[PDB]
């Protein structure tokens, strides 16, 4: 049941994809460490809550 994934390598030694392994030891998911592979989203719901969302080059108020 081992989980394997790619590290995002920053400073590369003079030696390419490097991996790390993770295994959960506990039944309760709350006991788990943080995966930290977090997806993002649009600012839109906050930066443009508009019913008619308009194109940046056209007049804001028409």
């Amino acid at each position: 049941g081992a989980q394997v994934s790619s590290q995002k390598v920053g400073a590369h030694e003079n030696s390419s994809t490097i991996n790390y392994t993770t295994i959960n030891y506990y039944k309760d998911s709350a006991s788990n460490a943080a995966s930290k592979q977090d997806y993002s989203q649009d600012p839109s719901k906050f930066t443009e809550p508009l019913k008619d969302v308009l194109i940046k080059t056209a007049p804001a108020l028409n």
């Binding site: 049941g1 081992a2 989980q3 394997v4 994934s5 790619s6």
Partner: peptide, 4 residues
Amino acid sequence: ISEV
């Protein structure tokens, strides 16, 4: 295993 499970490789992503």
